[PDB]
Amino acid sequence: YDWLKTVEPTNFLKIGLPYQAHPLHLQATTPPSILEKFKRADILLNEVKAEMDPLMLQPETEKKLFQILSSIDMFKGLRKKVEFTYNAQIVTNAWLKMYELLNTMNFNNTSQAFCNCELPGGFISAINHFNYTMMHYPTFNWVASSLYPSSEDHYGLYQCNPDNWLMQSPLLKKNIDYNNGDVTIASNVKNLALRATQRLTPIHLYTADGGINVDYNKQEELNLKLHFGQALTGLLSLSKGGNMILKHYTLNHAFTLSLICVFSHFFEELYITKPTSSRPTNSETYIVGKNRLRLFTPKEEQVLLKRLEFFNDTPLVDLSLYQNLLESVYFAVETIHLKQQIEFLNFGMKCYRHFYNKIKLLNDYLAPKKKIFQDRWRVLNKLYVLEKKHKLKLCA
């Protein structure tokens, strides 16, 4: 009915965080009152997220819920087009997300990528595709890692490029320095960053796209350690003047807020971002630091690695020293999560309610709206055919 066509196209949400003049002290203390706003956001957003619980109780309705949520992905058809028409590889939704990030973030240099938690490899491939067709980089050097458990590389990007991947297979289990890619493990983060700086100087682009897979309303808290080792891997490897793209989620926990406060001292610009192709129904955010200003001191490295090693929830910094910054993160929360995500979660519920058994009919009603959003994406993020000689080597 009406609601289905009035859908507004979404914007690349990009919220700058103000630069923090004072030096960094990793020390928590009496939290600033703004933390209360964030907890209200988290309660509210979990409330709206909790609305899909009844649907989760039976695998029948769960399946139909995710069909509906896939039906309101406004960009899925764009992936097939971009592959077929422009020779893009590994055109997952992450490819779209990375390519959109690279166009609108205007990075100074993306010619040397370390992509962490990358397993399929959309980010690498988008970076590759961007660097050749848009940045006209003579060559592209990259390294990647992903969690290789001793228990996936859907496109063969890992196995067809063993030199470019920094974790080790389960055949190297029992090695004293076995690095399975798990960035929740402090020694793996040291080793990964050491290994990257070795195959790659300088590293201009760090990306980290990891997420625990589980319950939906503890998602940020369940990922704090992963996302903290993601960040640490990047801050140990990224060169000065380098750039960082980290996948996050809701940003309401003090720890997350404190880690952003940490990020605030290392980059000249720092954005919380939500590409349009980042599914507005989820809480996923990408934290983007442009122009790394300086590297860790040996003390900062020690402390943060010790935190990752013996992890806990507590703020990394005194959060009341960053009132300005939390106000802008809160704006980002309000824009990305309390406004956009809640509306698109509500819209998704309304789609489930009215179409849970009429999936075909829902995709028929949205198809023109989908094309409008993919058209506008194609206008904003110019695409160019990638030359065979600059494809990635794929084994699948």
Q: Which helix (H) or strand (E) holds 271?
A: strand 267-274
| Distance between CA atoms of residues 188 and 182, nearest Å | 6
Q: Which amino acid is at 108?
A: N
Strands 13-16 and 285-292 come out as unpaired
d(CA 185, CA 181): 9
The C-alpha atoms of residue 75 and residue 380 are separated, in whole angstroms, by 14
Decide which of ligand SAH, a second copy, none touches 146; Cβ closer than 5 to 8 Å per partner kind. Answer: ligand SAH
**What is the per-residue burial (b if ≥16 Cβ within 10 Å, else e) of 341-364?**
bbbbbebbbebbebbbeeeeebbe
List residues near ligand SAH by CB under 6 A.
Answer: 92, 94, 117-123, 146-147, 181-184, 209-211, 226
Tokens read off for 210? 């990891």
Q: Residue 228 in contact with residue 258, Cβ under 8 Å? A: no
The item of a second copy, ligand SAH, none sharing an interface with residue 291, based on CB under 5 to 8 Å by kind, is none
Out of 9, 18, 54, 170, name the contact with a second copy by CB under 8 A.
Answer: 54
Query: Using an 8 Å Cβ cutoff, are 231 and 267 in contact?
Result: no
As a whole number of angstroms, the distance between CA 72 and CA 136 comes to: 35
User: 14 an active-site residue?
Assistant: no
Any known ligand binding at 289? no
Which tokens sit at 138? Answer: 């003579």
Q: Which listed residue (64, 225, 247, 274) is catalytic?
A: 247
Phi, psi of 244 (to 5 degrees): -135, 135
Does residue 2 have a known ligand-binding role? Answer: no
Are 371 and 80 a contacting pair, CB within 8 Å?
no
Other Cβ atoms less than 10 A from the Cβ of 93: the count is 17
CB 2 to ligand SAH: min, Å: 35
How near is the Cβ of 386 to ligand SAH at its closest, in Å? 17
Binding of a second copy by 46 (CB under 8 A): yes
What does 28 interact with, of a second copy, ligand SAH, none (CB < 5 to 8 A by kind)? none
Nearest to 102 by CA among 134, 145, 146: 134
74 versus 342: smaller Cβ distance to ligand SAH: 74
Closest approach, Cβ 244 to ligand SAH, in A, equals 14
The reply to whether 52 sits near a second copy by the rule CB under 8 A is: yes
**According to CB under 8 A, which residues from 23 to 42 bind a second copy?**
40
Q: Name the residue nearer to a second copy (CB basis): 9 or 54.
A: 54
Q: According to the binding rule CB under 8 A, does residue 338 interact with a second copy?
A: no
Q: Which does 107 bind (CB under 5 to 8 A by kind): a second copy, ligand SAH, none?
A: none
Q: Which stretch binds a second copy (CB under 8 A): 45-53, 242-250, 323-331, 374-382?
A: 45-53
Annotated ligand binding at 241? The verdict is: no
Stretch that binds a second copy, among 22-30, 46-54, 81-89, 244-252 (CB under 8 A): 46-54
Under DSSP, the state recorded for 11 is P
Q: How many CB atoms lie within 10 A of CB 236?
A: 20
Nearer to ligand SAH, 91 or 342 (CB): 91
Does 48 contact a second copy by CB under 8 A? yes
Residues annotated within a binding site for S-adenosyl-L-homocysteine? 92, 121-122, 182-183
Catalytic residue numbers, as ranges: 247
Residues annotated within a binding site? 92, 121-122, 182-183, 209
Interface residues toward a second copy, by CB under 8 A: 40, 43-44, 46-55, 57, 217, 349, 352-354, 356
